[PDB]
Amino acid sequence: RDDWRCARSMHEFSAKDIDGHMVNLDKYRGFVCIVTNVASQXGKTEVNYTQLVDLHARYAECGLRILAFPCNQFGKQEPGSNEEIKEFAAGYNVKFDMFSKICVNGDDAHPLWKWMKIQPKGKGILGNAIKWNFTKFLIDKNGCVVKRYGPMEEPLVIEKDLPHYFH
Ligand SMILES: [Cl-]
Ligand SMILES: [Cl-]
């Protein structure tokens, strides 16, 4: 239903993918997901893309999925078009799911991001707003937020928190 104020799961939202196609996020029902805001011109771009690609390579077979949302709200570090961003991600051998560029803060924020930020495990250390590029949310198979990791936490720190069976 796309209403951040009433939704109980990620699975109630839709989002436009980087190719311009609407995706119902209920396709992720049953899968553990990392949802993250990305940028191409951030100091931590390289380590985030490389480690997200590595996590996906090793855990896709267990059901790990990664949803990457480009966002230009942090130092204008995602200025390119969706087609440019798709090409950029392809240079990292990204095989996870790239979305069209969004806002993550303010009234124009994508509803999924409004929702994630208010979940009990979606709070940041110093409040809910997304602070910079490459915040990550871990989402369980039921579409609930389990943990949040900030811009300074490289993606491999999430590895520890994946289900034991993955390992
Ligand atoms: Cl996948
Ligand atoms: Cl914070």
Numbering used by the authors: 5 to 171
Give verbatim lines from the article.
The isoform GPX4 belongs to a subfamily of selenium-containing GPX enzymes and is unique in that it can also reduce hydroperoxides in complex lipids such as phospho­lipids, cholesterol and cholesteryl ester hydroperoxides, even when they are inserted into biomembranes or lipoproteins. The catalytic mechanism of the GPX reaction involves redox shuttling of this selenocysteine between the redox states selenol (Se–H) and selenenic acid (Se–OH). This was later extended by a conserved asparagine to form a catalytic tetrad, which in human GPX4 consists of Sec46, Gln81, Trp136 and Asn137. Recently, GPX4 has been identified as a key player in ferroptosis, a non-apoptotic cell death resulting from the iron-dependent accumulation of lipid reactive-oxygen species.
In order to produce the true wild-type protein, we employed a novel approach, first described by Eaton et al., in which wild-type GPX4 was co-expressed with selenocysteine insertion sequence-binding protein 2 (SBP2) in mammalian cells on a 10–30 l scale. The protein was purified and crystallized, and the crystal structure of the wild-type form of GPX4 was determined at 1.0 Å resolution. The structure was solved by molecular replacement. In the refined structure, the active-site selenocysteine residue Sec46 was clearly defined in the electron-density map, but the difference density maps showed a strong peak at the Se atom. The reduced occupancy of the Se atom in the structure may therefore be owing to radiation damage, aggravated by the long exposure time that was required to achieve sufficient completeness in space group P1. At the very high resolution obtained here, many side chains needed to be modeled in alternative conformations. Additionally, one of the histidine residues of the C-terminal hexahistidine tag could be built in the electron-density maps. The apo wild-type GPX4 structure described here is very similar to previously reported mutant GPX4 structures. In the wild-type apo GPX4 structure reported here, there is only very weak difference density on the Se atom, which did not justify modeling it as an oxidized form. This difference in oxidation may be related to the tenfold higher concentration of the reducing reagent TCEP used in our study.
